[PDB]
Design an enzyme around this catalytic site. Sequence first.
Site, short mmCIF file in Angstrom:
data_model
loop_
_atom_site.label_atom_id
_atom_site.label_comp_id
_atom_site.label_asym_id
_atom_site.label_seq_id
_atom_site.Cartn_x
_atom_site.Cartn_y
_atom_site.Cartn_z
N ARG A 296 -55.94 -15.00 44.90
CA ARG A 296 -56.58 -16.04 45.70
C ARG A 296 -55.61 -17.13 46.13
NH1 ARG A 296 -57.43 -20.88 42.86
NH2 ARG A 296 -58.36 -21.72 44.78
N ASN A 297 -54.44 -17.22 45.48
CA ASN A 297 -53.42 -18.21 45.82
C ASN A 297 -52.26 -17.62 46.61
OD1 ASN A 297 -54.31 -20.79 44.97
ND2 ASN A 297 -53.97 -20.21 42.83
N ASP B 227 -50.45 -22.57 46.30
CA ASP B 227 -51.30 -23.06 45.21
C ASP B 227 -52.38 -23.93 45.83
OD1 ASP B 227 -52.57 -23.94 42.94
OD2 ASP B 227 -50.78 -24.77 41.98
C1 LIG Z 1 -52.39 -27.82 53.04
C2 LIG Z 1 -51.78 -27.26 51.89
C3 LIG Z 1 -51.23 -28.08 50.89
C4 LIG Z 1 -50.61 -27.52 49.76
C5 LIG Z 1 -50.53 -26.13 49.56
C6 LIG Z 1 -49.87 -25.50 48.49
O1 LIG Z 1 -49.77 -24.27 48.50
N1 LIG Z 1 -49.23 -26.31 47.57
C7 LIG Z 1 -48.43 -25.86 46.55
C8 LIG Z 1 -48.30 -26.65 45.41
C9 LIG Z 1 -47.47 -26.27 44.36
C10 LIG Z 1 -46.74 -25.09 44.42
C11 LIG Z 1 -46.82 -24.27 45.55
C12 LIG Z 1 -46.10 -23.06 45.61
F1 LIG Z 1 -45.12 -23.04 44.71
F2 LIG Z 1 -46.89 -22.04 45.35
F3 LIG Z 1 -45.56 -22.89 46.79
C13 LIG Z 1 -47.66 -24.67 46.61
C14 LIG Z 1 -51.07 -25.34 50.58
C15 LIG Z 1 -51.71 -25.88 51.70
N2 LIG Z 1 -52.17 -25.09 52.70
C16 LIG Z 1 -53.29 -24.38 52.71
N3 LIG Z 1 -54.33 -24.66 51.93
C17 LIG Z 1 -55.42 -23.89 52.03
N4 LIG Z 1 -56.46 -24.13 51.23
C18 LIG Z 1 -56.49 -25.34 50.39
C19 LIG Z 1 -57.89 -25.82 50.12
C20 LIG Z 1 -58.76 -24.65 49.66
C21 LIG Z 1 -58.86 -23.66 50.79
O2 LIG Z 1 -59.76 -22.59 50.43
C22 LIG Z 1 -57.50 -23.08 51.10
N5 LIG Z 1 -55.49 -22.85 52.88
C23 LIG Z 1 -54.44 -22.59 53.66
N6 LIG Z 1 -54.46 -21.57 54.53
C24 LIG Z 1 -55.49 -20.75 54.76
C25 LIG Z 1 -55.08 -19.89 55.70
N7 LIG Z 1 -53.83 -20.19 56.05
C26 LIG Z 1 -53.45 -21.24 55.32
N8 LIG Z 1 -53.35 -23.36 53.58
#
Ligand SMILES: Cc1ccc(C(=O)Nc2cccc(C(F)(F)F)c2)cc1Nc1nc(N2CCC[C@H](O)C2)nc(-n2ccnc2)n1
Length: 277
Positions: free
Chosen positions: A139-140, A153
Site C-alpha cells: 500500500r506504500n 510512505d
Molecule cells: C504528498 C506526499 C507527501 C509525502 C509522501 C511520502 O511518500 N513521504 C515519505 C516519507 C518518508 C519516507 C519516504 C520514503 F522513504 F518512502 F520515500 C516517503 C508522499 C506524498 N505523495 C503522495 N501521497 C499520497 N497519499 C497520501 C495520503 C493518503 C493517500 O491515500 C495517498 N498519494 C500519492 N499518490 C497517489 C498516486 N500518485 C501519487 N502521493
Amino acid sequence: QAVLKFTTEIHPSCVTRQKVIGAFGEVYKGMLKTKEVPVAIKTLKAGYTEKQRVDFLGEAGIMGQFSHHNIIRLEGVISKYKPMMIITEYMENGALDKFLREKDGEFSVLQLVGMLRGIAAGMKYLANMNYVHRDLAARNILVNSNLVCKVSDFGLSGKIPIRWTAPEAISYRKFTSASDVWSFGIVMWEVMTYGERPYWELSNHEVMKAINDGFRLPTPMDCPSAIYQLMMQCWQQERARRPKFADIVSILDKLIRAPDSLKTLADFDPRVSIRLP
Ligand SMILES: Cc1ccc(C(=O)Nc2cccc(C(F)(F)F)c2)cc1Nc1nc(N2CCC[C@H](O)C2)nc(-n2ccnc2)n1
C-alpha cells in the site's frame, strides 16, 4: 534551513490543489506549473505544533535527499509561505496493492520479479542512507506507467501494520533495516499473490501467535522456488540471520538476468480437493 538543502523551493503561484486524497493538514491531488504536471500535495495547516513542523520539514528534507529510481520523487517544497507543502510526483496507476488486485493474473513471472527487484533496490538505498522505513507494505508503493515501483510512505492506513512487522519491532520497538527486510518478505508475498491479504482472515493476535509457533506464509500459486526461498529467509526470527538488502538485490538481479532460474516452481499446497477422472 539547512534541513532543506536537497530540496527545490516551489512558489505557491505554481500549485493548484484540486481534490482531497488524504488527511496536521490534508493531502491533495493537484497540478504543478514548471504542460502542467499532476502532483500530490501534502499541506501543513495553520495551528501546527513545533513537533509537527520539525517532522514536516524533516520529511521534506529527507525526500529531497533521496534521489533513486525506486523512491517517490519530490518535486519540491513550499516552506517560505503558509500553508507549507510537500509536493511529489503522481502516478495514475496508484498504489501497488490495489493495482495488483485489479490486475489479477495479468503479468508474467518476470514482470512480477522485476517489480520486486526495483522495490529491493529502493530499500537498499534507504537502508544505506540510514533511513528505516517502518511501514513497508504494498500500500506504500506507487507504480508508474513503466511498471516501476516507487517506495513511498503515506502514513498509517492509525492502523498498526502488525502482519507486515518483524517480531522485534512489535515486541520491543526495535525498528531497523532488518525489520524492513521482514516487511519486504511480506511485500514479496503480496506481489506474487496479486495482493492477497497476508495470513487471510487471521487476526493480529493470531498472526503473532502463528509466527511465534514457527508457522510461515505458504507459497503463492505458480511461484518460483527461488523467490519463495528468498521470502522465507526474510522471515527468520533471529534478526541477524536475515539477508541484508544488498543480498536481496543481488539475488533478484541474478535471477532476472538468468531467467531460466525462475522456471523451477515451488510446490503449492491445495486447500481444496477436486476429484475427476
Ligand atoms: C504528498 C506526499 C507527501 C509525502 C509522501 C511520502 O511518500 N513521504 C515519505 C516519507 C518518508 C519516507 C519516504 C520514503 F522513504 F518512502 F520515500 C516517503 C508522499 C506524498 N505523495 C503522495 N501521497 C499520497 N497519499 C497520501 C495520503 C493518503 C493517500 O491515500 C495517498 N498519494 C500519492 N499518490 C497517489 C498516486 N500518485 C501519487 N502521493
